Symmetry: D2
Subunit: 268 residues, 4 copies
């Protein structure tokens, strides 16, 4: 009697045990979902990481920049879940921007080739994944992507913020197409989560000023959030994604749900 009992849900984006997607997968399994996982490049690592999930799930390779992987994906998923079965949910938890597009590297000095790669992986791939999987999704189904509110500019995040603005726009178009299948498409805009990469950045991996700026941003988030914000805890974010995967938000699509402690609603 979990929130997601009987649902078949694909979860992308696990790379470490600090991945937001790891916690989405854990909570969904706790709530009765049957998962198919996708992973990029380091499949041995990902298998070993996902061995710590509450239940065993098949792992498929998916590089979203690889047209063959995308073209074969629906077939591979159907093989994993069995002929005649379809997916009820899809989680996009994929993002990347080359180091030239973040941190103390000046905003104007990011070459377009690097920005384009970041936008490919972080924004266009949400459309790619919906194209590939909508044909094997059930009516009432749900596609959910991860967002970081890009409505105002911020230090350090630079072109990744631009990629998120593009992702929000992409989501509104995906909703039009997904609606033809009876499927919802939405984003969860999370507050900052202290993943391995975010910890490295705060430690100065992309420069001291950038680290200092991101640290101030994290502190400001908890102070603005009327219920507080714990950047070391992905569970509230994972729960929100599961809410959208469930049957309990059936009239919400093309939209953005903020799992940020309410920080975006307060100026200070």
């Amino acid at each position: 009697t979990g929130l997601l009992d009987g649902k078949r849900i694909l979860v992308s984006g696990i790379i470490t045990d600090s991945s937001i997607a790891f916690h989405i997968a854990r909570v969904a399994q706790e709530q009765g979902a049957q998962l198919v996982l996708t992973g990029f490049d380091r499949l041995r690592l990902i298998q070993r990481i996902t061995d710590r999930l509450p239940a065993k799930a098949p792992l498929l390779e998916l590089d979203v920049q690889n047209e063959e992987h995308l073209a074969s994906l629906a077939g591979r998923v159907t093989e994993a879940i069995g002929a005649g079965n379809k997916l009820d949910g899809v989680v996009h938890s994929i993002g990347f921007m080359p180091q030239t597009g973040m941190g103390i590297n000046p905003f104007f000095d990011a070459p377009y080739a690097d920005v384009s790669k970041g936008i490919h992986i972080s924004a266009y791939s949400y459309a790619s994944m919906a194209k590939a999987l909508l044909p094997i999704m059930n009516p009432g189904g749900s596609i959910v992507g991860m967002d970081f509110d890009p409505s105002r500019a911020m230090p350090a995040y630079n072109w990744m913020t631009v990629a998120k603005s593009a992702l929000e726009s992409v989501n509104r178009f995906v909703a039009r197409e997904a609606g033809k299948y009876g499927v919802r498409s939405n984003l969860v805009a999370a507050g900052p989560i202290r993943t391995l990469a975010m910890s490295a950045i705060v430690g100065g991996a992309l420069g001291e000023e950038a680290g200092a700026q991101i640290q101030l941003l994290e502190e400001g988030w908890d102070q603005r959030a009327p219920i507080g914000w714990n950047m070391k805890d992905a569970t509230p974010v994972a729960k929100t994604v599961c809410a959208l995967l469930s049957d309990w938000l059936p009239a919400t699509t093309g939209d953005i749900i903020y799992a940020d402690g309410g920080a975006h609603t307060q100026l200070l």
Copy 2:
């Protein structure tokens, strides 16, 4: 094993079996919640209407314009649910604007006394209810109010739209206060629902032009919604309110969840 098993939830705003609050109450009871109901003025009618709910619930009188009713409310609720018990949820489903403030009556011709009454009931009362009930709410609790997206002006709705803009602002402040109790505050912005009053209005009760305009607005909503919009079905709205009353959106506050078919995300 309902979504709201064991929760104690107060539900305001039932007047007929077409009330959005009637459906919120029905769905919450289906999901295991224990309700306390509040009603305005016609308590005999409300008792008879609420006899059709899945479970019996106590009904308390609450006129939100009555300072004594508000001052006694927490005590009366505690009497109904038992000393030592607190509420886990509160639903504000209260709205009103005098006829001078809606329809074909020109926008400029609404006297301020009428507008002020509408704003009192529709916006300020969300703060009044939170003031009264926060002292008897548990941490992890949830306050939810009903909204109709007022970001753009519309024909006929006139000062009621202004009242909703004020309610959205009020909600952001209520969240600051509610956060001190570990409690969330949010609004559900619904698409149009064909209540008795909305049917009367479309039938011309506030003028022919106003009726025609609201009818065009309803038609436009279903056409813009990527998953469609059924104005005769309050269930998707009721489910969304229950989602916010549950433990599954624990990092969302001061915010607005759109149960509108995704219509607000599309231009056509």
Copy 3:
């Protein structure tokens, strides 16, 4: 050859030489406009203050809570500017909220009578003034009101923020009506300006915590503004109002122009 050469413009809201309206009036006169001024209650004071403007202008009494003043206003203006002449612009620079609705007085402790008075003066009066003056405005004309961005909640400002949310909604409806006369309606959302009252508040007139909070807010504004923000200088705000009064934004109505240093576009 000023920006506003030949235009006849009514300017409300002067009370001291720190009033934003004083600077709007000064800049408009510098740019060739012919003014009619309106003042509330302290007409001797206002006359003496406005004697420091670059040119003499008639001063009319207008209490926006007084229905007789509003009913006679168009006639009195026509008397001042001459039969057969109409206004090309109208400036609403009027705001008030009783002390119970701002500062350290708890948000929940403002009586509705006080909030209603604040909303009457700060929001409803924008509609009242447009109703009174549209019949004596020329096509191509412009109505401009003063706003403080209320999209997110803030400390201390409390019910005044709610009143601004209502004013933004009112402006969108006023634009519908004003469009029938060929007239635009817009708001300028200014950053904080150190008027006499704002200085008193920062000095603690509405409590120490409230003062401290507003001071932090002012400091944050200059730090977020990509071009900086000088709270002691109303001239950039006055220039923006004049821009909207001119012929150079002829396709903008129901809208909000931000004269805030760009602060609202940045998170830090």
Copy 4:
């Protein structure tokens, strides 16, 4: 005694006499500005078109996808305007999306190579142009780009809407950098203008359904605009750009000014 007397302004994006940039250039010259023009690929055509402007202006080649053109641009401009002189304004009026990214070609069927080209030209180039020209701009200067409101999805516009969402984000970051030079950066979001390409599209060049949809969108715009919207008249848009190029919006940056008849403020 024009609005822009004495200002030196670079204007990109003229290709035909229906180009929005043609009208921006004409109005700026009418208001006393000294122009430098940039053109892409068809320089003979552009020279002949710009011969119809009120005053002669030098024309420089600029393909924004060409790193050499961008690297030499400041030098070439300085040659055109004279050593020791700087620019006071810069107009970005550049946009493109391959046909696979617009019209009846399904949203999911646009190859990323095509989308990336569109985003390069339509969004990233706003940053490229600011990088190139900020070093030769005066304090008090102004950078302005053209936008089409992408907050909600629309039929047919597809990936061009995504590119505009990215441009809005890019503008907020450009404002941070431009502020260091005392320079403002803003976008004008215009309603639909019947350029040669828009006429071709409505005539079905990208499919019948797409044409029909864009035609309905244009009609809806005029009906929602409280002051109306004339898609055959670029002058109100050109005036708005000139407003931002002038000294009269000195506290607005990272922002978007809507020259759309107020259509975005109304639902119907």
